[PDB]
A paper describes a structure:
N-methyl-D-aspartate receptors (NMDARs) belong to the family of ionotropic glutamate receptors (iGluRs) that are involved in the majority of fast excitatory neurotransmission. NMDARs form heterotetrameric ion channels composed of the obligatory GluN1 subunits and GluN2 (A-D) and/or GluN3 (A-B) subunits. All of the subunits contain an amino-terminal domain (ATD), a ligand-binding domain (LBD), a transmembrane domain (TMD), and a carboxyl-terminal domain (CTD), which interact with each other in defined manners to mediate functions including channel gating, allosteric modulation, and cellular signaling. More recently, a number of studies on intact tetrameric NMDARs showed that the subunits are arranged as a dimer of GluN1-GluN2 heterodimers and that domains and subunits move in discrete patterns to control channel gating and allosteric modulation.
To understand the underlying factors that contribute to the different effects exhibited by IgG2 and IgG5, we sought to determine the binding site for IgG5. For this, we implemented single-particle cryo-EM on the intact GluN1b-GluN2B NMDAR-Fab5 complex and x-ray crystallography on the GluN1b-GluN2B ATD complexed to Fab5. The cryo-EM structure of GluN1b-GluN2B NMDAR-Fab5 was obtained at resolutions ranging from 4.45 to 7.51 Å as estimated by Fourier shell correlation (FSC) curves. Although the overall quality of the cryo-EM density is inferior to that of GluN1b-GluN2B NMDAR-Fab2, it is sufficient to capture patterns of conformational alteration. The cryo-EM data for the GluN1b-GluN2B NMDAR-Fab5 in the presence of glycine and glutamate was classified into four 3D classes, where one corresponds to active, another is similar to nonactive, and the other two are similar to nonactive. This conformational pattern is similar to that of the GluN1b-GluN2B NMDAR with no antibodies bound, thus, is consistent with the observation that IgG5 does not mediate inhibition and instead has a small potentiating effect on the function of GluN1b-GluN2B NMDARs. In the active conformation, the GluN2B ATD bi-lobe is open, and the heterodimeric interface of the GluN1b-GluN2B ATD is rearranged, which results in a rolling motion of the two GluN1b-GluN2B LBD heterodimers to open the channel gate. Thus, the prerequisite for activation of the GluN1b-GluN2B NMDAR is opening of the GluN2B ATD bi-lobe. Although both IgG2 and IgG5 bind the GluN2B ATD, they do so at distinct locations.
Author numbering:
A (entry chain N): 1 to 112
B (entry chain B): 755 to 802
C (entry chain M): 3 to 118
D (entry chain C): 25 to 52, 58 to 94, 103 to 186, 209 to 558
E (entry chain C): 711 to 812
F (entry chain D): 34 to 394, 403 to 509
The structure:
């Protein structure tokens, strides 16, 4: 699988802001038909729910604040209002051939 | 040193469908050294 | 949906079998995985099985070590472990097919295996 | 002389319209009506085609509603099929979709109406945004054909029909100068681009945007506000009206074609007779010469695709999200129903583009003695120099070179220049009264038109590559302008001569 | 370089050029000054001026190709009429001669 | 678990490809391929669909190979629609499957082999680079987008270091009108030695007729024929001028077995291209209806590990239009005997042809030279364009080989420069002849030994009629 990096691995943001979490792969991942990002958020004690399906294809049951995008190696997630329920650790898996490869990952907290 | 700097050429009509290709062609004939051919024809000297 | 069992505080390279409690769907039509979640919080895929055991794959620190048992009449997934290491201490939250689904889909609450 | 004709419609009262139209065209010449239905089942669609066109002389089908298998099973045998309720421009592709008829043109024909919109005020300044769709690409080639014959049009802007965060194009549009802009996209991409450019204030005063037709929906005004004029072809399209027009023109067609030479019979349902199809193109090629001066919706004229020429349009004012007709394009002439256009800043007039330019980007190169680059002091103030008469020589703050090494993390060095050029351009800034933008090339190149090693490209570099890419309003350099320079650029007259 | 690429009969020196061509003119200046180069082909307004400043170099031969001094800008700049008029005015009011002396 | 139901339509034999090597060679034998051979003789489309999912009633195929012995590009789009609706990867073989229209079908999982018209454009300019002949005239009709092809070829001749100048206007859609007035008005301005070709064939017969009635056909022009003008192999029209040359795929090497063997050797091992991910193999379905009814979950580029494969060294890489990036192409002359006589081939930017001597049919002369500076100076061709791309003539530096065999094409690609180059230029300018210019490789001027021949003098007196 194509290796990723993920930044920033920890981020405290204030409420209402547009929180942006970058992801950088090593190679170009997919075609114009689809992409590879399967984003996962949860807390310790929570199971990771799917957020994004390909690169901007949103999983059902996701609030409209979360919005991911990007292609090639550049990938992002934009949460244009920041709320109190957004404290979670964020992970994105994919497969060029191996379905579990991460970047560094990230945990999102709230700046107070 | 000449005590002016003006040129020599052609006057055409303003705002026509004109003569872009002749400008490209005379710039080519400049770049082909045909001006040097023309002065090799006429611009020859004595007291030089 | 999904629930893990058979995991706990274990030791070195003897035997250990995980047991995925399955409820609420058709288990015999989905693709499986194995879900090492480290205390360092860097996930590893141990192994994968298909809906009938006809498709398994092990990475390099998995083959020879760990095997999968997969029941569709019982609807229960199993991970028979052998030759464990202290690095293999990790949590497990399994997940199922994402419909051609390179990635997995269907997390429930799970277990932790501690090799010590 | 009994003629059978198929039909695919979603309503049985429209099948009654079909039978009544059969009886009306029977007034000449005999007609035969057959089964009319509609299926959301492509297998059952093609299966009903060659289990129900097992009649020998089914000559035409009128279909209704997306693409369909009957564009293939009937697109071979090969009878004309009248599409009614889908507006794909893929049916205009006469490579495969040659044997089909449509009453209305698909979305590509709005580009001619937008050229008519240009002709409404006879204005020029316009920028277009084009989505990445091959249908929209073909309409873009159509409007490029419409332009080749004036129009200013600045550039095409490319859009991806599945992307968001168009702000990278929106800041570029802020840098752009033409105030008039029309969108070409669907309404769901229009959600993003309308809310983003209204957030990024690219309404100008409320005037900037213009609308086509396919992005018009219910939510379309929960987006881009009032004053922003849209369009529609025919309001209240009675399908029975198109039925009557098609049946009248095909009655004309059957009284033409039935007084002709030997005609091959069509086959009987996908079995055994996969050898006879030439009759379809035969009577279709003769039928394309037919016209229609009659019509309940007016006279119908055929293009090369058989769509109706000389159509009408509802030019729409937006009085608090309304669609108020300020005019109609009557076939050849826009005939105005003129009301007040708001354009919420208040552009009720014919403003005819814009008036912007006073800022001049000047990309230069250092050259002795024309340009004498000299770095400033520690505070960015220039080290002040005098002439031989003690007069302070002018040094404007030269910025632009972000490389002296290039290959190391350099900074955009603040220098300042002096020569012929600096006092010359300062005199010219007194002359033309513009404002001034210094730029330089960090690598320091004129930059020649080398052939790029990929497929068939010979591209200028440096300053010529930058001015080619619009990264310069002005290039001041020692320039022996060749033919390849002059064939792309404008330039004033040279003044110094050398050898 | 574009002119020499347009040249045909100059082909006997093309490899001798391409073996030692420089991306910068000051590199060629110091190359002639240190005899790493022996012939630099450039316009008279630069070569004869730096030959008039630094007492190590000298120009040879006449003006081998008549060349001008042009400007570059984007298309549709209709103020270039008055720009060329101001060019002729600097040529007329001797401001070009002020730059010439200066 | 690889079902590939073998489909035959027409008259061919089933023993042409037995399995017979699929079981044997090397197949990483955990992939278990399965076949189902059947042979038909009709092209009835309802019979085709009932055959499709009476075949797919036997669920374990989901993707076949198929040979239809017809022209049928309409069915070549219909099966694209079939792979677009009953979505599965297929591969075409013969006849109607070789005749590929290649339109945009985003949900068809079906590719084939074949050359693109741009690949044909590159070889049709490469032969003109090889013989240094210059394109001046294409004829184009209205048949879709020829205009983009000539845009690409026009940018190519813009950026091929030489401006091989086109004629003025080449589109003449004379199917709309009589056209004969504008036919003569366009054929008046023709200044080419060569004519390149559009797509259509009945209009090719009609335009052969109008070139006969104009006076174009005899020997002042020659014609390069792509596919869809040739169409069927064994047919030549009657208004056909002498000396046409066709370019198509090598059907004498492609009307054969052992290429569907290559296809199944891509399909299997493409199974393990997908299993390199250890992708779960999608379950084959009793189908046509439930497979597009469940979901379109399978529509995520399984063929991306399939269009970048190389079998036995042969790079079988499929271009995105549905063609292959590396096809095998043939060069075949259409002769006055209405016979398909092969000139040669193209494979991987090389024109593997028989002779440097292109065959023809008192302008032609016979000439020999020997190197002598400064009459004749050195011969090294500049490989910037691959040919001697400056102002001097190929002197035909003759080839030589080991003396056990002939192996004499008679030419190494080497030009010549000097006085007699310009002399030959001026005398071909004044007298307007053509020449057969050679190089003396058999000695010097020569000393005549025992009265017998010597050199240049020897090569002339050996009755080759060459002019020294």
């Amino acid at each position: 699988d194509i290796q990723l990096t993920q930044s920033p691995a920890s981020l405290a943001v204030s409420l209402g802001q547009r929180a942006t979490i970058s992801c950088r792969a090593s190679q170009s991942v997919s075609t114009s038909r689809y992409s590879y990002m399967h984003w996962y958020q949860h807390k310790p004690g929570q199971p990771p729910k799917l957020l994004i399906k390909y690169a901007s294809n949103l999983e059902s049951g996701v609030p409209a604040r979360f919005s991911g995008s990007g292609s090639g190696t550049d990938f992002t997630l934009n949460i244009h209002p920041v709320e109190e329920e957004d404290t979670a650790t964020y992970y994105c898996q994919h497969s060029w051939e191996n379905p579990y490869t991460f970047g560094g990952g990230t945990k999102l907290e709230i700046k107070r | 040193k000449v005590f002016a700097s003006t040129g020599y050429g052609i006057a055409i009509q303003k705002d026509s469908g004109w003569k872009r290709q002749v400008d490209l062609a005379i710039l080519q004939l400049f770049g082909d050294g045909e001006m040097e051919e023309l002065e090799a024809l006429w611009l020859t000297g004595i007291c030089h | 949906k999904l629930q893990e069992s058979g995991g706990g505080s274990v030791k070195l390279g003897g035997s250990l079998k995980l047991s995925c409690v399955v409820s609420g769907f058709t288990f015999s039509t989905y693709y499986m995985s194995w879900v090492r979640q480290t205390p360092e919080k860097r996930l590893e895929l141990v192994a994968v099985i298909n809906s009938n055991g006809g498709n398994t794959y092990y990475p390099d620190n998995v083959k020879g070590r760990f095997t999968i048992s997969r029941d569709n009449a019982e609807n229960t997934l199993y991970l028979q472990m052998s030759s464990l290491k202290s690095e293999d201490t990790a949590l497990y939250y399994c997940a199922r097919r994402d419909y051609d689904g390179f990635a997995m889909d269907y997390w429930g609450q799970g277990t932790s295996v501690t090799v010590s | 002389k009994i003629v059978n004709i198929g039909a695919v419609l979603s309503t049985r009262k429209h099948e009654q319209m079909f039978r009544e139209a059969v009886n009306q065209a029977n007034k000449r010449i005999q007609l035969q009506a057959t089964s009319v239905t509609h299926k959301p089942n492509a297998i059952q669609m093609a299966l009903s085609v060659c289990e129900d066109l097992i009649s020998s002389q089914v000559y035409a089908i009128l279909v209704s509603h997306t693409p369909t298998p009957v564009s293939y099973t009937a697109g071979f045998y090969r009878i004309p099929v009248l599409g009614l309720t889908t507006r794909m421009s893929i049916y205009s592709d006469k490579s495969i979709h040659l044997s089909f008829l449509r009453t209305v043109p698909p979305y590509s024909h709005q580009s001619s109406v937008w050229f008519e919109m240009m002709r409404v005020y006879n204005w020029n300044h316009i920028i277009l945004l084009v989505s990445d769709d091959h249908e929209g690409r073909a309409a873009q080639k159509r409007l490029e054909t419409l332009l080749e014959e004036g129009p200013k049009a600045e550039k095409v802007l490319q859009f991806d029909p599945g992307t968001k965060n168009v702000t990278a194009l929106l800041m570029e549009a802020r840098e752009l100068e033409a105030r008039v802009i029309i969108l070409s996209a669907s309404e769901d991409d229009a959600a993003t681009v309308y809310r983003a450019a209204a957030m990024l204030d690219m309404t100008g005063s409320g005037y900037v945007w213009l609308v086509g037709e396919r992005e018009i929906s219910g939510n379309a005004l929960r987006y881009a506000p009032d004053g922003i004029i849209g369009l529609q072809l025919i309001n209240g399209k009675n399908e029975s009206a198109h039925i009557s027009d098609a049946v009248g023109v095909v009655a004309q067609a059957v009284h033409e074609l039935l007084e002709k030479e030997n005609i091959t019979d069509p086959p009987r349902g996908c079995v055994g007779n996969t050898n006879i199809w030439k009759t379809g193109p035969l009577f279709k090629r003769v039928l394309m010469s037919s016209k229609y001066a009659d019509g309940v919706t007016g006279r119908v004229e055929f293009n090369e695709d058989g769509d109706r020429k000389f159509a009408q349009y509802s030019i729409m004012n937006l009085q608090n999200r309304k669609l108020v007709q300020v005019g109609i394009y009557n076939g050849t002439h826009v005939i105005p129903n003129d009301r007040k256009i708001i354009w919420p800043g208040g552009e009720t007039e014919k403003p005819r583009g814009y008036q912007m330019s006073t800022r001049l980007k000047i990309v230069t190169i250092h050259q002795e003695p024309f340009v004498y680059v000299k770095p400033t002091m520690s505070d960015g103030t220039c080290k002040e120099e005098f002439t031989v008469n003690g007069d302070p020589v002018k040094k404007v703050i030269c910025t632009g070179p972000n490389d002296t090494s290039p290959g190391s993390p350099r900074h955009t060095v603040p220098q300042c220049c002096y020569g012929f050029c600096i006092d010359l351009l300062i005199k010219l800034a007194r002359t033309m009264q513009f404002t001034y933008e210094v730029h330089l090339v960090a690598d320091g190149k004129f930059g020649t038109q080398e052939r790029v090693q990929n497929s068939n490209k010979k591209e200028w570099n440096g300053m010529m590559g930058e001015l080619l890419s619009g990264q310069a309003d002005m290039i001041v350099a020692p320039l022996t302008i060749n033919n390849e320079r002059a064939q792309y650029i404008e330039f004033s007259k040279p003044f110094k001569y050398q050898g | 370089d574009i002119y020499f690429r347009r040249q045909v009969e100059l082909s006997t020196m093309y490899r001798h050029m391409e073996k030692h061509n420089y991306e910068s003119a000051a590199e060629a200046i110091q190359a002639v000054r240190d005899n790493k180069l022996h012939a630099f082909i450039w316009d008279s307004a630069v070569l004869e001026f730096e030959a008039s400043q630094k007492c190590d170099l000298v120009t040879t031969g006449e003006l081998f190709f008549r060349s001008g001094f042009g400007i570059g800008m984007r298309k549709d700049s209709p103020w270039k009429q008055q720009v060329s008029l101001s060019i002729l005015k600097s040529h007329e009011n001797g401001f070009m001669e002020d730059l010439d002396k200066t | 678990s690889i079902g590939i139901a073998v489909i035959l339509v027409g008259t061919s034999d089933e023993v042409a490809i037995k399995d017979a090597h699929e079981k044997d060679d090397f197949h990483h034998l955990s992939v278990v391929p399965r076949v189902e051979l059947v042979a038909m003789n009709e092209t009835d489309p309802k019979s085709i669909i009932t055959r499709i999912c009476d075949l797919m009633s036997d669920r374990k195929i989901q993707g076949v190979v198929f040979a239809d012995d017809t022209d049928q590009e309409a069915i070549a789009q219909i099966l694209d629609f079939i792979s677009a609706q009953t979505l599965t990867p297929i591969l075409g073989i013969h006849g109607g499957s070789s005749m590929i229209m290649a339109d945009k079908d985003e949900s068809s999982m079906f590719f084939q082999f074949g050359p693109s018209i741009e690949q044909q454009a590159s070889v049709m300019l490469n032969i003109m680079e090889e013989y240094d002949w210059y394109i001046f005239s294409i004829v184009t009709t209205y048949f879709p987008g020829y205009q983009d092809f000539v845009n690409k070829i026009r940018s190519t001749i813009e950026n091929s270091f030489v401006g091989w100048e086109l004629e003025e206007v080449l589109l003449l859609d004379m199917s709309l009108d009589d056209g004969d007035s504008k036919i003569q008005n366009q054929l008046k301005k023709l200044q080419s030695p060569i004519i390149l070709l559009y797509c259509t064939k009945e209009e090719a017969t009609y335009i052969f007729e109008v070139a006969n009635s104009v006076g174009l056909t005899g020997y002042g022009y020659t014609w390069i024929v792509p596919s869809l003008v040739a169409g069927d192999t064994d047919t030549v029209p009657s208004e056909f001028p002498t000396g046409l040359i066709s370019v198509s795929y090598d059907e004498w090497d492609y009307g054969l077995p052992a290429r569907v063997r290559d296809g199944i050797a891509i399909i299997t091992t493409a199974a393990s291209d997908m299993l390199s991910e250890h992708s779960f193999i999608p379950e084959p379905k009793s189908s046509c209806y439930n497979t597009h009814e469940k979901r379109i979950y399978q529509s995520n580029m399984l063929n991306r590990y399939l269009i970048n494969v190389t079998f036995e060294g042969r790079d079988l890489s499929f271009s995105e239009d549905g063609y292959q990036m590396h096809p095998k192409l043939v060069i075949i002359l259409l002769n006055k005997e209405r016979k398909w006589e092969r000139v040669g081939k193209w494979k991987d930017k090389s024109l593997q042809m028989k002779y440097y001597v292109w065959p023809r049919m008192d302008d032609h002369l016979s000439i020999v030279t020997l190197e002598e500076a400064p009459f004749v100076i050195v011969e090294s061709v500049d490989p910037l364009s691959g040919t001697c791309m400056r102002n001097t003539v190929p002197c035909q530096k003759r080839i030589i080989s080991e003396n056990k065999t002939d192996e004499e094409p008679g030419y190494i690609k080497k030009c010549c420069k000097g006085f007699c180059i310009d002399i030959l230029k001026k005398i071909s300018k004044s007298v307007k002849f053509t020449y057969d210019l050679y190089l003396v490789t058999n000695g010097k001027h020569g000393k005549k030994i025992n009265g017998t021949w010597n050199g240049m003098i020897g090569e002339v007196v050996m009755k080759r009629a060459y002019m020294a």
